[PDB]
Design a protein around this ligand. Structure first.
Ligand code: FES
Length: 94
Protein backbone atom coordinates (compact mmCIF):
# COMPACT_ATOMS: atom_id res chain seq x y z
CA UNK A 1 0.00 0.00 0.00
CA UNK A 2 0.98 3.66 -0.20
CA UNK A 3 1.18 6.19 2.59
CA UNK A 4 -1.19 9.01 1.65
CA UNK A 5 -0.82 12.11 3.78
CA UNK A 6 -4.07 14.06 3.65
CA UNK A 7 -3.36 17.71 4.45
CA UNK A 8 -6.67 18.90 5.52
CA UNK A 9 -7.52 22.36 6.76
CA UNK A 10 -7.53 20.87 10.26
CA UNK A 11 -4.17 19.17 10.04
CA UNK A 12 -2.43 16.19 8.52
CA UNK A 13 -3.47 12.57 8.64
CA UNK A 14 -1.49 9.77 6.96
CA UNK A 15 -3.50 6.75 5.86
CA UNK A 16 -2.56 3.62 3.95
CA UNK A 17 -4.14 3.20 0.53
CA UNK A 18 -3.70 0.12 -1.66
CA UNK A 19 -2.67 0.61 -5.28
CA UNK A 20 -6.11 -0.63 -6.37
CA UNK A 21 -8.15 1.67 -4.09
CA UNK A 22 -9.27 5.23 -4.75
CA UNK A 23 -7.93 7.81 -2.34
CA UNK A 24 -11.41 9.04 -1.32
CA UNK A 25 -12.56 5.53 -0.55
CA UNK A 26 -9.57 4.79 1.64
CA UNK A 27 -9.94 8.13 3.39
CA UNK A 28 -13.67 7.62 4.06
CA UNK A 29 -12.96 4.15 5.46
CA UNK A 30 -10.22 5.56 7.71
CA UNK A 31 -12.90 7.90 9.16
CA UNK A 32 -12.21 11.15 7.33
CA UNK A 33 -15.28 12.96 5.99
CA UNK A 34 -13.93 14.57 2.84
CA UNK A 35 -16.15 16.41 0.33
CA UNK A 36 -17.75 14.48 -2.53
CA UNK A 37 -20.92 14.18 -4.56
CA UNK A 38 -20.87 12.36 -7.90
CA UNK A 39 -18.05 9.86 -7.17
CA UNK A 40 -17.65 9.50 -10.95
CA UNK A 41 -14.88 11.97 -11.85
CA UNK A 42 -17.38 14.44 -13.35
CA UNK A 43 -17.48 17.31 -10.84
CA UNK A 44 -15.16 19.26 -8.56
CA UNK A 45 -16.58 18.31 -5.13
CA UNK A 46 -13.78 15.92 -4.19
CA UNK A 47 -10.92 18.01 -5.56
CA UNK A 48 -7.58 17.86 -3.88
CA UNK A 49 -4.11 19.08 -4.84
CA UNK A 50 -1.13 16.78 -4.99
CA UNK A 51 1.75 18.41 -3.10
CA UNK A 52 4.09 15.43 -3.52
CA UNK A 53 3.98 11.91 -4.95
CA UNK A 54 1.94 10.63 -7.87
CA UNK A 55 -1.58 9.49 -8.56
CA UNK A 56 -3.38 7.85 -11.45
CA UNK A 57 -6.66 9.63 -12.18
CA UNK A 58 -6.99 8.44 -15.78
CA UNK A 59 -10.75 7.85 -15.05
CA UNK A 60 -11.41 11.48 -14.40
CA UNK A 61 -13.17 13.87 -16.81
CA UNK A 62 -13.89 17.19 -15.10
CA UNK A 63 -10.42 18.67 -14.67
CA UNK A 64 -8.73 20.31 -17.62
CA UNK A 65 -5.14 19.75 -18.68
CA UNK A 66 -3.85 22.89 -16.93
CA UNK A 67 -5.55 21.97 -13.66
CA UNK A 68 -4.08 18.53 -13.69
CA UNK A 69 -0.65 19.96 -14.62
CA UNK A 70 -0.93 22.13 -11.48
CA UNK A 71 -1.52 19.05 -9.33
CA UNK A 72 -5.33 19.07 -8.94
CA UNK A 73 -6.85 15.66 -8.47
CA UNK A 74 -10.35 14.21 -8.23
CA UNK A 75 -9.90 12.05 -5.17
CA UNK A 76 -12.97 9.91 -5.91
CA UNK A 77 -11.27 8.39 -9.02
CA UNK A 78 -7.58 8.68 -8.13
CA UNK A 79 -5.37 5.72 -7.29
CA UNK A 80 -2.02 6.35 -5.57
CA UNK A 81 1.07 5.29 -7.48
CA UNK A 82 3.54 6.37 -4.78
CA UNK A 83 3.57 7.61 -1.24
CA UNK A 84 1.95 11.01 -1.67
CA UNK A 85 0.66 14.14 -0.01
CA UNK A 86 -2.75 15.52 -1.00
CA UNK A 87 -4.24 18.79 0.21
CA UNK A 88 -7.98 18.29 0.58
CA UNK A 89 -10.96 20.66 0.22
CA UNK A 90 -9.42 22.29 -2.86
CA UNK A 91 -12.57 22.92 -4.91
CA UNK A 92 -12.54 26.64 -4.13
CA UNK A 93 -8.90 26.79 -5.36
CA UNK A 94 -9.66 25.46 -8.82
S1 FES B 1 -17.15 13.60 -6.32
FE1 FES B 1 -17.53 14.37 -8.40
S2 FES B 1 -15.54 14.13 -9.35
FE2 FES B 1 -15.23 13.27 -7.37
Amino acid sequence: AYKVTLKTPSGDKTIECPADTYILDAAEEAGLDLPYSCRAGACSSCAGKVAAGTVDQSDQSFLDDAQMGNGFVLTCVAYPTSDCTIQTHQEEAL
